[PDB]
Amino acid sequence: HFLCGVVEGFYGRPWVMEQRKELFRRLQKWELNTYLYAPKDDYKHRMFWREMYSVEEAEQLMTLISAAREYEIEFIYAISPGLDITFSNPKEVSTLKRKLDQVSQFGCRSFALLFDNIDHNMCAADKEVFSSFAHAQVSITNEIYQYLGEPETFLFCPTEYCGTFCYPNVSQSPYLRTVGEKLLPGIEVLWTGPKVVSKEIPVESIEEVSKIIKRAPVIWDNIHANDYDQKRLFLGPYKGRSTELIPRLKGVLTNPNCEFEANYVAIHTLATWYKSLYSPQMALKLALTEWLQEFGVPHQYSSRSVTLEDLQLLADLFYLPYEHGPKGAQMLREFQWLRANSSVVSVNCKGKDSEKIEEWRSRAAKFEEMCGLVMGMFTRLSNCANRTILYDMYSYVWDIKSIMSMVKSFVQWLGAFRGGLAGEFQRLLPIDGANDL
Amino acid sequence: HFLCGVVEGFYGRPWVMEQRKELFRRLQKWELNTYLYAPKDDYKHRMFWREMYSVEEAEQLMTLISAAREYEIEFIYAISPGLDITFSNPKEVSTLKRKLDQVSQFGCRSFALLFDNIDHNMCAADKEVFSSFAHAQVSITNEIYQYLGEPETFLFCPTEYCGTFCYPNVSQSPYLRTVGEKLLPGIEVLWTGPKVVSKEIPVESIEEVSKIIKRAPVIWDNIHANDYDQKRLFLGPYKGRSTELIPRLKGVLTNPNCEFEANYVAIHTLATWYKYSPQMALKLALTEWLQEFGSVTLEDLQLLADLFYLPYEHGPKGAQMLREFQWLRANSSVVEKIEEWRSRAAKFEEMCGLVMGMFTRLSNCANRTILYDMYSYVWDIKSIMSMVKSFVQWLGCRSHSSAQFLIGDQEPWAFRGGLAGEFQRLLPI
């Protein structure tokens, strides 16, 4: 069957077990079926992948893997040994087997080997044994498949895991030719689309890759991932992927925002898209409408609120990687126009103009009200009762509100170390606002 | 005696109780004595301050207040009712008293009333009873002082809490004149310096404020606060405050970084200063911190601290990379005695390598709690230096190539900041 769900596949602080249980609740609520465990910086997933879990760690994994079963979500355990492993040393191979067995005894029946972002060339001993980097990965992936008894679901993420990472192209890649041929027919292949973060995943691109790897891939979708930029959050709907892909694919797993509570939209809309033909804008409405209920006012026994419009504003400000939501783009166009047409100056060298200065002013007030809606959105969100949500999003909301606050001032006015060192180096690169509207 | 320690006084995710216990450990380890609880976004501290703590909330505060006593750290409970309180309605006043009693029964004997970020506002009904905003605040602050039995430590943070917030200046403020006169002698006054985030706290500025409020203030120090800027972290030493201030002050509480594990340097160096050379204090603190990791070297931490140093200053290795990159960009047009450009480019490209190395070893460390609290910030700097290294490379490879810097369709991280970033670029800052 078709895999649809979430991969916890991002860099940084991983999610905690209470959060993952709440995740399984939601995947079931929305009729998704899969979870792939692959947090890049849970140390025993990648950095110290040889190390067996301690007894108190094992108690938490088995408790987690059983919540997965309790909630009818399939649990796929991933391991990323590609960094420093010697493929031909059988102690390494045995260590990998030992590690998998251990998790299997916690009651896990599905697995994955990830070879994402790693040096293309092996050590000396390995070049001796294997003809290519591809051959080495397959050989151990197959061996491990078989050693585990050819389990229900088994995933392999290649080093050339998207269009732009294929040397020299997708169709003629010796690496992918080798995966297609030698990887055992029951092992599945993860693929992120044309790019690492794909704006669109066109059907023809999936036909093209499927030909060379001899099967339908499972999409690891980075569309809502935000690990690569401190300032970014993605609350927009699943988008750029035709429902026509579903027959051509073995699954879709989203790698979403690091901040757990910020993924309501990202996952609800994936679900909506799975069950459909699909309208991003309508899926967002469904998802925002449902999300609103999760934001209380606090209970009060002594005394002397977030709306749907607030959430719509918030999502349009923190939307998708290649697109702002309509209320965000509107405030942007309007502010550009105001700055451009600020010839309502006292030091005026066009005498004046009645009509053109009435328009500027009129549009400034209208804009100053839009800025108010941002401040209002922040105020009511900080007054909400679900603090877990407030905290997961606080810095992002504060930021936008403070900057809009300063933009409002600046427009009014028309009538320094910020970002820190990183900010200062950034301003000096001349591609700083190179994708701005 | 004299109050020195930490205020948990910032906006955002507050610290958790395990973190606060570990904090009390450290304050004692380093001979600090105080903690002020005032996280802006515990809902019952400020927004819904009338509300009593629930049973499960009360169980956690009692458990926390007793760890404070266990570790010989004084615990001061703050409350920020300034937003919507009616000062003249005695139900409001009673509600405030009810709330304080509740915390006292959790075993807490020290308190504070905060009136920080509030608009010089009275509702009517209040303007009827009280002649000014200042009069109204003191009247309830005094009443509450007395009602609690005039406790050991009691703090009052004024609305005019720093130089730039005093109308029209510090010396002639009717607001502060009124606080100085009518606030009872055993209540203390919190003050953040000339600014909200003070670069320096000069002695004369403290003499000046002490005169008008008729006592020595307790400094709420925002020097290492990072709640106001997503991209900023402060690992530099306590600085800009003369050791001559210590006799002129009733205390110093730092309001430090939101990310708990990032405050080792910020608090160790405060302690060192409480007994001064900033660069020697940093060395003491970085040397001690290195042990808590585990492979990460001292040179790695020195680089990291210099990259994320202080609000008005970068550390020497950071400022150096900056001046050198400015020079390279400025003098690129010559790509006769410009073997110096090339030479300086390679030398710079090696500096960028040390950043990548620092990040690599930090992600391989065994103290994951620390890694996570700082991960975003370290990734960011590494990615940006990585792109700076490229750009310098590209500048050099230009006598043999006329390719664009960005070649074709990019991944989103090439273009930083999102919508916030785009509005920022449109301001002149």
Numbering used by the authors:
A (entry chain A): 59 to 334, 373 to 400, 552 to 662, 680 to 701
B (entry chain B): 59 to 333, 374 to 392, 552 to 592, 602 to 695
The authors write:
A structural overlay of OGAcryst-D175N in the substrate-free and substrate-bound states illustrated that substrate binding did not induce any changes in the dimeric structure of OGA.
Recently, our group and others have independently identified crystallizable constructs of OGA that comprise the catalytic domain and stalk domain, and published the apo form structures and enzyme complexes with active site inhibitors. These reports consistently showed that OGA formed an unusual arm-in-arm homodimer, where the catalytic domain of one monomer covered by the stalk domain of the sister monomer to create a potential substrate-binding cleft. Exploiting our previously reported construct of OGAcryst (residues 60–704 with the unstructured insert residues 401–552 replaced by a glycine–serine (GS) linker), we solved the structures of a mutant OGAcryst-D175N (catalytically impaired but retaining the ability to bind substrate) in apo form and in complex with each of four synthetic glycopeptides.
